[PDB]
Paper text:
Cthe_2751_is a 15.8 kDa singleton from an anaerobic, hyperthermophile Clostridium thermocellum, with an unknown function. Therefore, based on primary sequence analysis, Cthe_2751 is a non-Pfam singleton with an unknown function. Each monomer is made up of 8 α-helices arranged in a spiral pattern around a vertical axis that runs through the centre of the protein. The structure reveals an all α-helical topology similar to those observed for nucleic acid processing proteins.
Cthe_2751 crystallized as a dimer in 3 different crystal forms. Superimposition of the dimers crystallized in different space groups revealed no obvious differences in the position of the Cα atoms suggesting an identical mode of dimerization in all the 3 crystal forms. To find out if there is a difference in the packing arrangement of the dimers in the 3 crystal forms and to quantify it, a computer program was compiled and a calculation was performed to analyze the inter-dimer distances of 2 neighbouring dimers for all 3 space groups. As expected, the inter-dimer distance between 2 closest dimers in space groups C2221 and P4122 is relatively similar when compared to that of the distance between dimers of space groups P212121 and C2221 or P212121 and P4122, where there is almost no recognizable co-relationship. This result further supports the inferences of crystal packing analysis where we saw that the dimers rotate less than 3° along the C axes during the transformation from P4122 to C2221 resulting in only a minor change in crystal packing. A mathematical calculation performed on the dimers of Cthe_2751 crystallized in different space groups corroborated the findings of the crystal packing analysis of molecules packed in different space groups.
Numbering used by the authors:
A (entry chain A), B (entry chain A): 4 to 130
């Protein structure tokens, strides 16, 4: 199934073949798929998004990981693109991460962007 | 199942009960659900989005309807919020609508917004 993971930044070749796979099925590669969301400007990232959203239930653990992670850009995309499409339980699963991130002291400027994304999403998707 | 449709603009009461329903199951109400996406600033609209995205396959016909529709704001939300999350076949199902909308002559200013949304989405999600 690993052959199903995009091998580079433009690799849309396996998508039609991932669209067939399901929740039980795709989980073994699901975190690798998410790695494509590190930069949304990769032409592949846009193709991957909908797949990882459809299969958001099996992706939750791994979505947490990314938010506890040390990639600023990665969790920024994951927050910006995915939170809005989490179903109530899943959406509630990440509240804590959004909470923590909104909390960080703004040392560098990249930190700012993601504090602000979190305050605003919390503000919008939780009221 | 119709009792499952939000009865007003803030009505989040049936969501947890819709999250249980599936593709075979929910289609009878799916177009009514979409009617909540007419204004995204309705507190309910944000809760509904993820449901109608998860069930995008049964929603396709009805997504077309809205794009051929006469609601500017409605198709604007539907385009802005949903296209980015359509899986390849579904995404290809609406290309024509995006194409047509990008084509409209800009008489009034509200028309502008949706021409521009369509050129830009076409430009981004199709390359």
């Amino acid at each position: 199934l690993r052959d199903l993971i995009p091998k580079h930044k433009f690799d849309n070749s396996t998508i039609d073949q991932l669209c067939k796979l399901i929740d039980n099925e795709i989980e073994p590669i699901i975190f690798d798929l998410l790695k494509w969301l590190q930069d949304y400007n990769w032409p592949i990232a846009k193709d991957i998004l909908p797949v990882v959203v459809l299969h958001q239930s099996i992706a939750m653990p791994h979505i947490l990981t990314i938010l506890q992670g040390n990639d600023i850009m990665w969790k920024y995309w994951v927050i910006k693109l995915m939170i809005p499409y989490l179903i109530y339980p899943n959406k509630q699963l990440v509240k804590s991460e959004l909470e923590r991130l909104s909390s960080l002291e703004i040392i560098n400027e990249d930190i700012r962007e993601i504090v602000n994304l979190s305050k605003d999403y919390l503000h919008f998707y939780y009221p």
